[PDB]
Design a protein around this ligand. Structure first.
Ligand code: ADP
Ligand code: MG
Ligand code: MG
Lengths: 247, 155
C-alpha cells in the first residue's frame, strides 16, 4: 500500500521499463529505466544512509555542483519519500570503461585514463565545494554504518601518523565502474556520493591499488606517476589504502 | 571542526601539547566519535604515559569501554607497556573487564606473552579462572605459545 517512490514520480516514469542493476555493490538500489527514445537511471538510498557519503542526496548535490566542471549525468528529479532518497538522472555519455576496455587487453590505456582523471580533478576550483572528506568524517560514518568485532587493526591504524593534507577535488571511488569513455576522452563520471574536497593522495592511492591488483606490475605504477608528472609518496599512498582496508 | 573532534585527533596523533591546550579550552574529556573510542583509549594506544594522568585529572573515565568492549586496560595489555598498565590500575581500572570475545586484559597479555604485565594484573586481583566465550581460558593460550614461562607462573 505504501510505495518507496512518490505517486508523482511513479507517474513520471510509467512508460519506461525498469531493469534493476544486478552488478552494483553499494547500499543503493539502481534501476535502468529503458525508454523508447532514451534511458534514465534511478538511484535510491534508505533513511539510515541519510547524511552519509552513501546518501543519494549528496550525490545529487555534487552532480549539480559539478555541472560545467566535469562531465556528469543531469539531475532530472530528486525527492525524499518515507525516509528514502530518490534521484532520477540521465544516462552517461559513452561506455563504462571496465566493460569495453579493461578486456581490450591494453593496460597502458587504463593507467592513462586514471592519470587523465587525476588531472581533471586537480583543475577544479573547490573554494565553494559543498562537501569535505577527512579522517574523522570517514571514521564517524563507519561508526554509523555499523550501528546494528576484532579491534586490533583499527588501533594499529590509528597509531599510524597521518600525512598533512593538500586538498583537491576528489572522486572518492575512482574506478572504471564509475568512469565512462568515448572516442578517446573521459566522457562521464558516476557514483559521486563520496566526492568533494579531500587529500590528493586519496584518489591516487586508489589508482595505485587498482593498478596493483588488477594489472600487477611495478613499472605500470611507475608509468602512472610519469603520466602525472609527480614523484610517489609511498607513505601517503600506504596510509590511505590502510584506511580504506578497515573492514 | 569542533573541540571534540580536534581533541580526538590530537590524542590520536600523539600531540600532548595540543591535548593540553584543548582540555584547557573546554574540550569534552569523554568525547567519542567513532567506535566508543575516547581520548584516553587513544593516548594509551600510543604509549603516552604523561598525558594519561592529565586526562584522568580532567576526570577521564578509566573504564570507558569502546564498541568492542576494549577498555584502556585491554589496550595497554595489547600494547605491552608495563608503565601504562600500572598507572591505569592505580586509578581504578577494572582488572576483570570483558570484551566481546570475552577476553579480560589478562587474556590479552597472555596472548602477547607480556609476562611482567601478567604479574601485575594478577596482584590487582585478576581472576585466572576467567573463561572467554569459546571456553578457552588464559591457560589454553599458554599452550598456543608452548611456554614453560607463563604456565610455570600459574598454580
Ligand atoms: N547515469 C548513469 N548512466 C549510465 N549507467 C549508470 C548510470 N548510473 C548508474 N549506472 C550503472 O549502474 C551501475 C552502478 O551504479 P552506481 O551509481 O555506480 O552505484 P554504486 O554506488 O552501488 O556503485 C554503474 O556501474 C553503471 O553500470
Ligand atoms: Mg557508491
Ligand atoms: Mg559506482
Amino acid at each position: 500500500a505504501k510505495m518507496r517512490i512518490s505517486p508523482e514520480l511513479k507517474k513520471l516514469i510509467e512508460k519506461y521499463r525498469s531493469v534493476k542493476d544486478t552488478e552494483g555493490m553499494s547500499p543503493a538500489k539502481v534501476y535502468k529505466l529503458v525508454g523508447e527514445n532514451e534511458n534514465l537511471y534511478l538511484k535510491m538510498t534508505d533513511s539510515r544512509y541519510k547524511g552519509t557519503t552513501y546518501d543519494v542526496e549528496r550525490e545529487k548535490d555534487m552532480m549539480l555542483w559539478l555541472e560545467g566542471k566535469l562531465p556528469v549525468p543531469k539531475v532530472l528529479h530528486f525527492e525524499r519519500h518515507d525516509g528514502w532518497s530518490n534521484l532520477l538522472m540521465s544516462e552517461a555519455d559513452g561506455v563504462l570503461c571496465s566493460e569495453e576496455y579493461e578486456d581490450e587487453q591494453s593496460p597502458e590505456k587504463i593507467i592513462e585514463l586514471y592519470a587523465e582523471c587525476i588531472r581533471l580533478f586537480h583543475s577544479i576550483d573547490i573554494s565553494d565545494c559543498p562537501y569535505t572528506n577527512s579522517l574523522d568524517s570517514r571514521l564517524a560514518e563507519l561508526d554509523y554504518l555499523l550501528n546494528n568485532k576484532d579491534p586490533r587493526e583499527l588501533y594499529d591504524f590509528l597509531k599510524t601518523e597521518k600525512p598533512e593534507e593538500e586538498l583537491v577535488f576528489s572522486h572518492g571511488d575512482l574506478g572504471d565502474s564509475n568512469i565512462f569513455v568515448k572516442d578517446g576522452k573521459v566522457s562521464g563520471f558516476i557514483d559521486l556520493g563520496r566526492s568533494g574536497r579531500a587529500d590528493k593522495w586519496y584518489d591516487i592511492a586508489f589508482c595505485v591499488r587498482s593498478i596493483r591488483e588488477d594489472i600487477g606490475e611495478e613499472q605500470y605504477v611507475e608509468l602512472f606517476f610519469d603520466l602525472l608528472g609527480i614523484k610517489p609518496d609511498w607513505e601517503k599512498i600506504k596510509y590511505y589504502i590502510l584506511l580504506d582496508e578497515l573492514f | 571542526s569542533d573541540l571534540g573532534k580536534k581533541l580526538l585527533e590530537a590524542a590520536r596523533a600523539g600531540q600532548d601539547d595540543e591535548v593540553r591546550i584543548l582540555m584547557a579550552n573546554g574540550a569534552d574529556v569523554n568525547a567519542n566519535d567513532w567506535f566508543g573510542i575516547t581520548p584516553l583509549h587513544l593516548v594509551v594506544n600510543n604509549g603516552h604515559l604523561e598525558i594519561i594522568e592529565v586526562l584522568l585529572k580532567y576526570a577521564a573515565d578509566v573504564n570507558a569501554s569502546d564498541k568492542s568492549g576494549w577498555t584502556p586496560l585491554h589496550l595497554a595489555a595489547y600494547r605491552g607497556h608495563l608503565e601504562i598498565v600500572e598507572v591505569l590500575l592505580k586509578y581504578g581500572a577494572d582488572v576483570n573487564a570483558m570484551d566481546y570475545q570475552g577476553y579480560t586484559p589478562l587474556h590479552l597479555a597472555a596472548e602477547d606473552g607480556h609476562l611482567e604485565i601478567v604479574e601485575v594484573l594478577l596482584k590487582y586481583g585478576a581472576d585466572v579462572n576467567a573463561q572467554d566465550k569459546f571456553g578457552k581460558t588464559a591457560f589454553d593460550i599458554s599452550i598456543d605459545n608452548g611456554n614453560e614461562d607463563l604456565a610455570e607462573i600459574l598454580q
